[PDB]
Design a protein around this ligand. Structure first.
Ligand code: NA
Ligand code: NA
Lengths: 225, 217, 221
């Protein structure tokens, strides 16, 4: 029901030690990247946030991060979910430390929030109060700066992004144009921690507004047609 | 059943007034684009045709129009459908007018047509007698020229495009290479209005032929 | 159940006898490509292998070959499946010959194999002993050289590719980065037929290992 947290789930985790050179080349790894940590889950943006948290916890870089077409509910196999993440580090021990931090974050209480009775509309409005190396590079900001990580379905996201930008002293960093692979959209915005929180609150309120009344236009403006 | 119209449905409509400069930049809006009209629906090509119609009905441009991966039946949320369209114009009045025209067209009787008993094969074969400013740009043709807008599933579309091109003096302007995001295919063809209609008729007949006999070669 | 073949199915096949010049342009056909053979099926990588086999059997080229977003189980229409392939040749007879070779290969016993009890994890580990003109070009190798054609879901594929590369005397040719349209991943690897076979066996073993222990990563490395 509305305001319920949708629990995210990790599906698979593995380590590759001493990554083969042939794979290192196709993944465009750095010379010091000797080991990989692999993860899949049923929620991509929670996982991306978790991977960023991993870069604060261990000597790891996010070297691969992609979402699956049409999202987890349309996965055709058990472990595909809707995201694959790859951490790289100098040793299996560092990768292992990174993956443990990732897993712990995914199960920390974060998640998309439901906007209606059957959870058929949901959104992410996460204040990342201290970015790691992954999301700061994605956003083009300095490490440790704050972000509003805003995700919703396509029309809700566009409407609510406008609301969020107007509500808060925040800057556009990265636009997720609709559709991304999972048919969502949104943005990374930056500013002070209080401004990012204000943007998150406004984004959430705007998504809920659309969910509650998606076709109000018909009665107000399409009458006598 | 065969020849039934599949009714297209609008799922959500919203307007943005005084669009934020940050969003204007990311959408690559023009300076006169102050207001946005947003729409989602469960049929993308009908919506694209309707958005083009709106540019003839109001002072609006189609500034964004994209389809969802794997189509409306695989939507994971209620309002995603399989298309998002954005109209831009100088005022809320003009984008409401544009949306009203879009809605009218979507409800006008246009739509995908079923080619079999359980409506599991369908196609779009729509003659656009006079393009607006959106489908003329997509096709790379002069504004106001006619189009045949032809869509079907991948193999049906390739087979039926062949038939359409042979049936009248038309040129292929834009090829929708399989898969588009919704796993369809097709093309925009141009020529005289009567040639485009002949192409539409041939396209429809060819899709029906494949539906009736999918493995016969 | 585990080790079961998942049988691939052909959904539609048609011939265009004299392709129109407008269609030839958009498909970037060459002048000698007069006839087209169209096929869809519910298994893309089996079909790609089959199309390559067709080029060995007949004077046909693979001129178009693409997978559908989210795979055959999410198809919204009857004939879309998860792949469209197009053969081009000099005549309808030659295209028909190519299509027959394609269909025969699809039904030959090749296919994805289940890695668990409800067939919810599967993989492809096919040794192409002698490539035709399609997969040799895709891989960037001489026509007639061998490939391991390795496909699995995203994490399994990455883990199992590393295993295959370490186990077998093979080289990386083409990386299918996750996700491809059907949300799979994998690679084409080349080497002797022996080495390609060893890569296939190691890939299969590694995918099965992940299926049996999907969350396990704490063991000594
Ligand atoms: Na589905
Ligand atoms: Na090796």
């Amino acid at each position: 029901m509305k305001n319920d947290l949708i629990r995210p789930n990790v599906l698979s985790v593995k380590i590759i030690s001493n990554v083969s050179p042939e794979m290192a080349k196709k993944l465009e790894l750095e010379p010091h990247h000797k080991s990989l940590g692999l993860i899949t889950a049923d929620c991509d943006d929670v996982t991306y946030t978790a991977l960023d948290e991993a870069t604060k916890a261990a000597e790891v870089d996010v070297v691969y991060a992609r979402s699956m077409y049409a999202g987890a509910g349309n996965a055709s196999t058990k472990l595909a979910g809707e995201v694959i993440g790859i951490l790289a580090g100098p040793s299996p021990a560092e990768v292992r430390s990174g993956l443990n931090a990732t897993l712990d974050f995914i199960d920390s209480g974060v998640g998309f929030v439901s906007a209606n009775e059957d959870d058929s509309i949901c959104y992410y409005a996460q204040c990342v109060s201290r970015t790691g190396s992954y999301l700061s590079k994605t956003a083009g900001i300095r490490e440790g700066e704050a972000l509003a990580y805003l995700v919703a379905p396509p029309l809700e996201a566009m409407y609510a992004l406008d609301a969020a930008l107007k509500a808060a002293d925040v800057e556009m960093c990265e636009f997720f144009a609709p559709p991304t692979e999972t048919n969502f959209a949104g943005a990374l915005l930056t500013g002070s921690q209080s401004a990012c929180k204000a943007a998150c609150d406004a984004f959430a309120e705007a998504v809920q507004s659309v969910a509650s009344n998606p076709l109000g236009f018909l009665e107000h403006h399409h009458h006598h047609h």
